């Protein structure tokens, strides 16, 4: 509940909706710039530091064997904390294609506070999921092993039903649950009858043996359901086993942003309530060993713009710090392209 306005550098224009903020050891990094990578920064990933509410998008370099990657506009990202690394799946390259690669991003070396990433390309073998965006991925541990759960999002029509009067129409992918092994690149689908409708832009929390799926949009009936789901996974020495459950007391949100304010307690901020109604309230969720609860916190102060605008976007910075953006008026005294804001909860 601490809002602040942020001044920007000169290359403000490299922020589009759907970036990703990779957080390494307190340092914050920007991914998903607008347009293909220029010659000011040939990699397309930015060092993103903010001092005195003034931020500086500095370049970053790669390793000797890294895989130079396209700027994805809506991927799924997860924090695989086993060295620390990030996992990027899917997304939407600026030629409006969709990718189906796994990008593994870690730090090679950091000298003189100047980082040097590396990123490798892992391609799944087996029951590979179809390329999509807006989905979610989460790494979960059990019995000394780790698997990446993946719940699907929306995508294009398959390559036989695409007509070029409706070439750019999207439909939700089939609501299975994919399980991914990273060390060998394996995939496994799981069909389960408790998940019926397609879901996109939902929120996914991962507490140490189970993943909670909350909110989301469903394109089959253009409704935003309120029902959350709990997914329990265990991999034995044999084949892994997945279970779902519908728990009561959820909420209806889509494209919300959720971060970790304390140990085992998360907070979620404004996505969208209805197709015209933004969500100004915020909700704190309290985790546990087996039980959670969702309560509403004290609905913080908004400025004239964030009360008055039509859309927003943003993500979290890592230390409980939400980055947000606002379009801003065009019919004005030549107002800027975007306004930016920082929310703190400490």
Partner 1 sequence: SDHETLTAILSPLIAEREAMKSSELTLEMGGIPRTFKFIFRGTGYDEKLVREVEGLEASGSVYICTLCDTTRLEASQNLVFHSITRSHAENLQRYEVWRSNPYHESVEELRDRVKGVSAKPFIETVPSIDALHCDIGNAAEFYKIFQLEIGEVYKHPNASKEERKRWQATLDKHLRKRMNLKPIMRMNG
Partner 2 sequence: TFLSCSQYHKMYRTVKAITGRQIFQPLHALRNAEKVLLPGYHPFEWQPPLKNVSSRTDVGIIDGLSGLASSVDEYPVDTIAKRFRYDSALVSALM
Residues at the contact surface with partner 2, assessed by CB under 8 A: 16-18, 73-74, 92, 159, 162-170, 200-201, 217, 254-255, 272, 275-276, 310-311, 327
Contact 12, 336 (CB under 8 A): yes
Contact 219, 200 (CB under 8 A): yes
Chain position carrying tokens 């400490």? 346
Q: Choose between 132 and 230: whose C-beta lies nearer to partner 2.
A: 132
CB of 140 to partner 2, least distance (A): 26
* Binding-site partner at residue 327 among partner 2, partner 1, none, CB < 5 to 8 Å by type: partner 2
Interface with partner 1, residue 64, by CB under 8 A = yes
Rg of the chain over Cα atoms, rounded to whole angstroms, equals 20
Q: Choose between 4 and 96: whose C-beta lies nearer to partner 1.
A: 96
CB of 88 to partner 2, least distance (A): 18
Q: Choose between 69 and 258: whose C-beta lies nearer to partner 1.
A: 69
Q: Choose between 12 and 242: whose C-beta lies nearer to partner 2.
A: 12
Phi-psi bin for 108: left (phi > 0), alpha (psi -120 to 50), beta? alpha
Interface with partner 1, residue 221, by CB under 8 A = no
Please tell me whether residue 121 adopts helix, strand or coil conformation.
strand
* Binding-site partner at residue 310 among partner 2, partner 1, none, CB < 5 to 8 Å by type: partner 2
Q: Choose between 36 and 184: whose C-beta lies nearer to partner 1.
A: 36
Nearest to 151 by CA among 135, 133, 174: 135
* Binding-site partner at residue 61 among partner 2, partner 1, none, CB < 5 to 8 Å by type: partner 1
Size of the site for partner 1 (CB under 8 A): 28
d(CA 265, CA 250): 16
For residue 67, give both structure tokens.
């895989």
Burial of 68 (0-12, 13-18, 19+ CB in 10 A): exposed
Task: Write the CB contacts of 214 (distance below 8 Å, at least 6 apart in sequence).
Answer: 202, 203, 204, 205, 228, 229, 250, 251, 253, 268, 285, 294
Contact pick of 10, 26, 39, 304 for partner 1 (by CB under 8 A):
39
Angle at 273 between CA 269 and CA 274, to 5 degrees: 155
* Binding-site partner at residue 184 among partner 2, partner 1, none, CB < 5 to 8 Å by type: none
* Binding-site partner at residue 121 among partner 2, partner 1, none, CB < 5 to 8 Å by type: partner 1
Contact 268, 282 (CB under 8 A): yes
Task: List, in sequence order, every residue forming a beta bridge with 136; answer none if it has no partner.
Answer: 151
Interface with partner 1, residue 289, by CB under 8 A = no
* Binding-site partner at residue 272 among partner 1, partner 2, none, CB < 5 to 8 Å by type: partner 2
Interface with partner 1, residue 62, by CB under 8 A = yes
Interface with partner 1, residue 18, by CB under 8 A = no
CB of 162 to partner 1, least distance (A): 8
Residues between 147 and 166 with contacts to partner 1, criterion CB under 8 A: 164-165
Contact 59, 39 (CB under 8 A): no
Footprint of partner 1 (CB under 8 A): 16, 34-39, 42-43, 61-62, 64-70, 73, 93-96, 121, 164-165, 167-168
């Amino acid at each position: 509940m601490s809002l602040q306005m942020v001044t920007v550098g000169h290359n403000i224009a490299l922020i589009q909706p759907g970036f990703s903020l990779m957080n390494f050891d307190g340092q914050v990094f920007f991914f998903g710039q607008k347009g293909w990578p220029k010659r000011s920064c040939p990699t397309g990933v930015f060092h993103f530091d903010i001092k005195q509410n003034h931020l500086k998008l500095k370049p970053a370099i790669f390793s000797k064997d890294s895989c130079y990657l396209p700027p994805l506009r809506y991927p799924a990202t997860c924090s695989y904390k086993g060295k620390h690394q990030y996992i990027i799946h899917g997304g939407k390259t600026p030629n409006n294609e969709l990718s189906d690669k796994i990008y593994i991003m870690s730090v090679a070396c950091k000298n003189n506070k100047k980082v040097t990433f590396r990123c490798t390309e892992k391609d799944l073998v087996g029951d590979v999921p179809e390329p999509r965006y807006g989905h979610s991925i989460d790494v979960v541990y059990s019995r000394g092993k780790s698997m990446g759960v993946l719940f699907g999002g929306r995508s294009y029509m398959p390559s036989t039903q695409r007509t070029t009067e409706k070439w750019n129409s999207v439909a939700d992918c089939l609501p299975h649950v994919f399980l991914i092994d990273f060390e060998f690149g394996c995939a496994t689908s799981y069909i389960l009858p408790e998940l019926q409708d397609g879901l996109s832009f939902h929120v996914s929390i991962a507490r140490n043996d189970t993943v909670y799926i909350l909110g989301g949009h469903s394109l089959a009936s253009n409704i935003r359901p309120a029902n959350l789901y709990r997914i329990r996974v265990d991999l034995p020495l044999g084949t892994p086993a997945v279970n779902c459950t519908v728990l009561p007391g959820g909420i209806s949100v889509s494209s919300a942003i959720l971060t970790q304010t304390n140990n085992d307690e998360f907070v979620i901020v404004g996505g969208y309530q209805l197709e015209n109604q933004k969500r100004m309230v915020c909700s704190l969720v309290s985790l546990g060993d087996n039980t959670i609860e969702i309560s509403e916190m004290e609905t913080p102060d908004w400025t004239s713009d964030i009360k008055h605008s039509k859309i927003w976007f943003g993500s979290n910075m890592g230390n409980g710090t939400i980055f947000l953006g606002i379009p801003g008026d065009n019919k004005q005294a030549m107002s800027e392209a975007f306004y930016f804001y920082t929310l703190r909860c400490s």
